[PDB]
Design a protein around this ligand. Structure first.
Ligand code: HEC
Length: 159
């Protein structure tokens, strides 16, 4: 139905198993979920329009993560490429690394005490999930879906 994606027909780096596991099964007010109950994306009109959290997660990524992890999750001299990471990592593995950090030299900081990051954890997951599935390229999202009212009142409370 309207839960289905419609991506770039000239999308050359799609990962079908990762994309299939990210198919939207449910929608609760601008928020999409997969059959496992975990957040997911929703691309529309041939790879140009994106759901709110993919849009929002891009911006939070550029703000708070791009420095060590490179543009579009491509990787850097000090940190791995998160577009490949979210092929293996489950939603809760990602959330735990983000909240508590990871070490080996090589340190990923714990962001748990950083509400400007933790309150957008689902946004970061969704966007980087869309990268891992090859459902979004290395562009900035243009057309988006409207920001839902649900997001604004929990953004209120979380911050
Ligand atoms: C500073 C440099 C940063 C910043 C600001 C962020 N990350 Fe994180 N990250 C970083 C390192 C050195 C590592 C590797 C740690 C190790 O080798 O043990 C990581 C790792 C991750 C992971 C797990 C990667 C994997 O195992 O595949 C995730 C997920 C991750 N980083 C995500 C992430 C996000 C969402 C950030 C947003 C603010 C972020 N990092 C910041 C170094 C750094």
């Amino acid at each position: 139905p309207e839960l289905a994606n419609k991506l770039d027909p000239n999308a050359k780096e799609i990962d079908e198993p990762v994309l299939k596991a990210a198919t939207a099964a449910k929608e609760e007010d601008g928020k999409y979920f997969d059959k496992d109950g975990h957040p997911t994306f929703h691309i529309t009109n041939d790879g140009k329009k994106v759901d709110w959290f993919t849009y929002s997660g891009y911006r939070r990524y550029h703000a708070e993560c791009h420095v060590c992890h490179g543009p579009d999750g491509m990787g850097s001299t000090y940190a791995p490429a998160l577009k490949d990471s979210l092929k293996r990592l489950s939603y809760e593995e990602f959330y735990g690394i983000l909240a508590g950090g990871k070490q080996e030299n090589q340190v990923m900081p714990a962001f748990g005490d950083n509400k400007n990051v933790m309150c957008y954890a689902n946004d970061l997951y969704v966007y980087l999930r869309a990268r891992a599935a090859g459902a979004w390229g290395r562009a900035r999202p243009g057309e988006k879906e409207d920001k839902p009212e649900s997001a604004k009142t929990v953004e209120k409370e979380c911050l």
